[PDB]
Design an enzyme around this catalytic site. Structure first.
Site, PDB file in Angstrom:
ATOM      1  CG  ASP A  78      -1.797   1.250   1.285  1.00  0.00           C
ATOM      2  OD1 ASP A  78      -2.357   1.645   0.241  1.00  0.00           O
ATOM      3  OD2 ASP A  78      -1.927   1.831   2.386  1.00  0.00           O
ATOM      4  CG  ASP A  80      -1.674   5.184   1.923  1.00  0.00           C
ATOM      5  OD1 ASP A  80      -2.114   4.462   1.004  1.00  0.00           O
ATOM      6  OD2 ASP A  80      -1.918   4.979   3.131  1.00  0.00           O
ATOM      7  CG  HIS A 115      -3.675  -0.959  -3.451  1.00  0.00           C
ATOM      8  ND1 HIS A 115      -4.891  -1.492  -3.084  1.00  0.00           N
ATOM      9  CD2 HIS A 115      -3.485   0.123  -2.661  1.00  0.00           C
ATOM     10  CE1 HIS A 115      -5.415  -0.763  -2.114  1.00  0.00           C
ATOM     11  NE2 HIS A 115      -4.581   0.223  -1.840  1.00  0.00           N
ATOM     12  CD  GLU A 139      -0.931   0.058   6.445  1.00  0.00           C
ATOM     13  OE1 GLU A 139      -1.635   0.877   5.819  1.00  0.00           O
ATOM     14  OE2 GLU A 139      -1.063  -0.160   7.667  1.00  0.00           O
TER      15      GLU A 139
HETATM   16  C1  LIG Z   1     -10.843  -2.858   8.704  1.00  0.00           C
HETATM   17  C2  LIG Z   1     -10.274  -1.810   7.752  1.00  0.00           C
HETATM   18  C3  LIG Z   1      -9.374  -2.226   6.647  1.00  0.00           C
HETATM   19  N1  LIG Z   1      -8.818  -1.260   5.722  1.00  0.00           N
HETATM   20  C4  LIG Z   1      -7.939  -1.749   4.631  1.00  0.00           C
HETATM   21  C5  LIG Z   1      -8.443  -1.515   3.426  1.00  0.00           C
HETATM   22  C6  LIG Z   1      -7.374  -0.567   2.627  1.00  0.00           C
HETATM   23  O1  LIG Z   1      -7.414  -0.857   1.196  1.00  0.00           O
HETATM   24  C7  LIG Z   1      -6.225  -0.864   3.137  1.00  0.00           C
HETATM   25  C8  LIG Z   1      -5.235   0.313   2.996  1.00  0.00           C
HETATM   26  O2  LIG Z   1      -5.702   1.411   3.727  1.00  0.00           O
HETATM   27  P1  LIG Z   1      -5.871   2.829   2.911  1.00  0.00           P
HETATM   28  O3  LIG Z   1      -4.572   3.175   2.223  1.00  0.00           O
HETATM   29  O4  LIG Z   1      -6.232   3.922   3.887  1.00  0.00           O
HETATM   30  O5  LIG Z   1      -7.083   2.640   1.807  1.00  0.00           O
HETATM   31  P2  LIG Z   1      -6.886   2.439   0.182  1.00  0.00           P
HETATM   32  O6  LIG Z   1      -5.440   2.164  -0.166  1.00  0.00           O
HETATM   33  O7  LIG Z   1      -7.740   1.281  -0.276  1.00  0.00           O
HETATM   34  O8  LIG Z   1      -7.362   3.801  -0.601  1.00  0.00           O
HETATM   35  P3  LIG Z   1      -6.538   5.222  -0.523  1.00  0.00           P
HETATM   36  O9  LIG Z   1      -5.195   5.003   0.133  1.00  0.00           O
HETATM   37  O10 LIG Z   1      -6.329   5.724  -1.928  1.00  0.00           O
HETATM   38  O11 LIG Z   1      -7.337   6.218   0.285  1.00  0.00           O
HETATM   39  O12 LIG Z   1      -6.552  -1.096   4.655  1.00  0.00           O
HETATM   40  C9  LIG Z   1      -9.155   0.184   5.892  1.00  0.00           C
HETATM   41  O13 LIG Z   1      -8.716   1.001   5.157  1.00  0.00           O
HETATM   42  N2  LIG Z   1     -10.056   0.614   7.006  1.00  0.00           N
HETATM   43  C10 LIG Z   1     -10.610  -0.370   7.926  1.00  0.00           C
HETATM   44  O14 LIG Z   1     -11.322  -0.024   8.807  1.00  0.00           O
HETATM   45 MG   LIG Z   2      -3.609   3.367   0.285  1.00  0.00          MG
END
Ligand SMILES: Cc1cn([C@H]2C[C@H](O)[C@@H](COP(=O)(O)OP(=O)(O)OP(=O)(O)O)O2)c(=O)[nH]c1=O
Ligand SMILES: [Mg+2]
Ligand SMILES: [Mg+2]
Length: 280
Positions: A78, A80, A115, A139
């Site tokens: 991940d 960001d 991703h 991440e």
């Molecule tokens: C349980 C839970 C899982 N996740 C998971 C799903 C995400 O795809 C993953 C990475 O977190 P994020 O990076 O915050 O979300 P994202 O990558 O899908 O979209 P963007 O960064 O463009 O805003 O963590 C959450 O984000 N929130 C939650 O509450």
């Molecule tokens: Mg992300």
């Protein structure tokens, strides 16, 4: 067209799909077959891709998700806040990682992240999340987490590859009652502080919270410090030097001397707390 993507066909082999919906700053996973919230440990809370597609239109969720398990071969990376307004890479660390981990890459649902899905094994000496001064972050997870699926292929990298991931040690940082139980306890008692407002003397909020920590932590100042650093009252002033100590250390020590009684985990003398709960 999502099933055309070779990487999506590879993920569709597994009945580890969910759907997700935006709730404030978060993306909650949901069971595609009944709309209830989905655990990342209950396999029957998931479905195959066909059930995820149908549940996506039924409950009007934001998109698809894939739950990562230990037994499947996938690693989820991940990145960001690494993209432009043009959805172009602006962070050099992200640009270097993409040069050395050429696998399936897609644009994250916020349009400013990425991703990378890889087949391999994570190094065992790296942190899951690494935050940079940039504001961007890295991440990495291979199990115990779901990832959103967009299908917005980036740079035509549409195939999951088998790659060595030892190179991730150059990007992520290295790493070698209990606190969480105490935090939950203070929250249920209403002793967990809100983030300071406009016109709030933050330093007296610190002292009031430090007094409560001295009780619920049994005047264990190390635990008081570990717990304070996870609170809405943490800031840089906590570690600024002051008279051969730090502002945070002097605050915790004065709380330990001020506070009379302590919470005994074996006696459950929650009623001995001298401070009323935080109002709401
Ligand atoms: C349980 C839970 C899982 N996740 C998971 C799903 C995400 O795809 C993953 C990475 O977190 P994020 O990076 O915050 O979300 P994202 O990558 O899908 O979209 P963007 O960064 O463009 O805003 O963590 C959450 O984000 N929130 C939650 O509450
Ligand atoms: Mg992300
Ligand atoms: Mg895995």
């Amino acid at each position: 067209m999502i099933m055309e993507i070779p990487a999506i066909k590879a993920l569709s082999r597994y009945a580890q799909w969910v759907i997700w919906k935006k709730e404030r700053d978060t993306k909650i996973p949901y069971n595609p077959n009944n709309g209830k919230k989905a655990s990342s440990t209950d396999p029957l809370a998931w479905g195959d891709i066909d059930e995820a597609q149908a549940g996506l239109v039924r409950y009007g969720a934001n998109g698809l998700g894939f739950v990562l398990t230990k037994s499947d071969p996938f690693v989820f990376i991940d990145l960001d806040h690494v993209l432009d307004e043009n959805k172009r890479v602006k962070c050099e660390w992200a640009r270097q990682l993409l040069k050395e981990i050429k696998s399936y890459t897609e644009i994250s649902p916020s349009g400013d992240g990425l991703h990378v899905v890889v087949s391999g094994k994570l190094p065992d000496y790296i942190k899951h999340k690494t935050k940079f001064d940039d504001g961007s972050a890295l991440e990495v997870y291979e199990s115990g987490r779901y990832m959103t699926i967009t299908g917005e292929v980036f740079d035509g990298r549409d195939d999951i590859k088998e790659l060595d991931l030892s190179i991730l040690g150059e990007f992520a940082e290295h790493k070698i009652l209990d606190d969480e139980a105490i935090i939950d306890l203070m929250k249920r008692k209403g002793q967990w502080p809100d983030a300071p407002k406009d016109g709030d003397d933050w330093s007296s909020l610190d002292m009031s919270f430090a007094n409560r920590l001295a009780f619920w932590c049994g005047k264990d100042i190390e635990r008081m410090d570990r717990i304070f650093r996870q609170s809405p009252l943490m800031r840089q002033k906590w570690d600024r030097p002051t008279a051969g100590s730090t502002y945070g250390r002097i605050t915790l020590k004065k709380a330990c001397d001020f506070v009379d009684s302590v919470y005994d985990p074996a006696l459950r003398n929650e009623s001995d707390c001298p401070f009323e709960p935080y109002n709401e």
